[PDB]
């Protein structure tokens, strides 16, 4: 909704990415990432159940993998927006490194972490 304020900064990103659900797997084109979600292109044969969780795998180079449980937030005109739900410590540590390096200011990262830890206050 247009009156809402985005909590986290979205970063244009293009790492090799997949979406998983059950036994299903889709290669997807990544568009952006944030500390709390991703934007991907809708793949072929998209029968992903929108009411059930998905998993995203972002391949950073050859030997770094960011894994996150995601929920479908919105879908339209060939795009899929996902919200991060659960993420392992190593994956969020890589994600935090990505976000801080692309923000270029550690204090902007701290404000993002402040919004993340207080989201369910």
């Amino acid at each position: 909704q247009h009156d809402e304020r985005r909590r986290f900064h979205r970063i244009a990103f293009d790492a090799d990415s997949e979406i998983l659900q059950g036994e299903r797997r889709w290669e997807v084109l990544l568009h952006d990432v944030s500390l709390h979600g991703i934007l991907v292109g809708q793949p072929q044969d998209w029968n992903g159940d929108p009411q059930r969780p998905f998993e995203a795998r972002l391949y950073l180079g050859l030997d770094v993998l960011i894994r996150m449980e995601i929920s479908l937030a919105w879908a339209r005109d060939g795009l899929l927006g996902f919200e991060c739900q659960h993420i392992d410590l190593d994956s969020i540590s890589h994600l935090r490194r990505l976000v801080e390096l692309n923000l270029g200011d550690e204090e902007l990262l701290e404000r993002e972490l402040a919004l993340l830890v207080s989201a369910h206050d």
Binding site: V64, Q85, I92, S93, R96, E100, N102, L116, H120
Partner: protein, 267 residues
């Protein structure tokens, strides 16, 4: 441990972070600094203090928990290449300037300083003029700990031979070691946004930029690599991560075969 299990609950409930039940050791290491400054004497007290919800303590905990530290002498072979090929190549020619980009907790620039010292001890005063290592990252607590040069048991328990530990570190009480001041003096730490201009950095014989460009898009990392090329003296070398290739810059960089691994010569 009950306190540790409650901490796992905190991380999941607040941020959705899933902490394995096998990471008590990692929690203690990453929160040691913060608990010291905060006057907190146990994880259990930390868990009590973080229920709430006001203040910036919860952010500081998540901050410390999500910072990765780098490894000592990461991959081994780039430092052998440095001592066996690059430094002899440069001596056949002047103060040495090395850029350690995105130095994180400092393990790489201090590893470079130790490798330089090992070369200088086995090779005369062949490095007549001296060596300067410029180590850069974003300002904050991680770069601040790099400057301090102090490391805990977890950081010291891997990648460092007992020969190097005795030769290059000072014990600083239980479970802490500091890089020896002579080794630290070679390194100068600076705050630098890799997305900003490198004009203030001067020129380098060598750039180490390892396992960092994976955090940038294809277009952004190409621009960083192009501007890194501007900081290299002619014929200088760029070191990437062991699994990193340099994409779409054939006129600027020439791959050079090492034994094993590769480095990139600035054309």
């Amino acid at each position: 441990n009950a306190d540790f299990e409650l901490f796992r609950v905190f991380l999941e409930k607040t941020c959705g972070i899933v902490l394995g039940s096998n990471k008590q050791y990692l929690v203690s290491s990453r929160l040691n600094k913060l608990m010291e400054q905060q006057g907190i004497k146990s994880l259990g007290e930390l868990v009590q203090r973080i229920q709430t919800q006001r203040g910036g303590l919860r952010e500081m905990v998540v901050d410390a928990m999500t910072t990765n530290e780098t490894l000592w002498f990461r991959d081994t072979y780039p430092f052998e290449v440095l001592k066996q090929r690059v430094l002899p190549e440069l001596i056949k020619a002047q103060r040495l300037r090395i850029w350690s980009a995105a130095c994180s907790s400092g393990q790489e620039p201090y590893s470079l300083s130790m490798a330089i010292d090992e070369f200088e001890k086995t090779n005369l005063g062949q490095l007549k003029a001296g060596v300067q290592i410029v180590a850069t990252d974003l300002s904050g607590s991680m770069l601040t700990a790099a400057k301090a040069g102090e490391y805990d048991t977890l950081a010291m328990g891997r990648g460092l031979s007992p020969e190097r530990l005795q030769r290059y570190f000072d014990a600083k009480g239980p479970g802490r070691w500091a890089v020896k001041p002579a080794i630290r003096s070679r390194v100068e730490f600076r705050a630098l946004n890799l997305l900003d201009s490198y004009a203030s950095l001067g020129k380098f014989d060598m750039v180490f930029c390892r396992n960092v460009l994976i955090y940038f898009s294809a277009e952004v990392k190409r621009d960083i690599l192009l501007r890194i090329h501007g900081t290299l003296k002619p014929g200088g070398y760029l070191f990437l991560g062991a699994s990193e290739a340099l994409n779409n810059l054939p006129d600027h960089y020439q791959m050079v075969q090492c034994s094993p691994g590769i480095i990139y010569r600035a054309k």
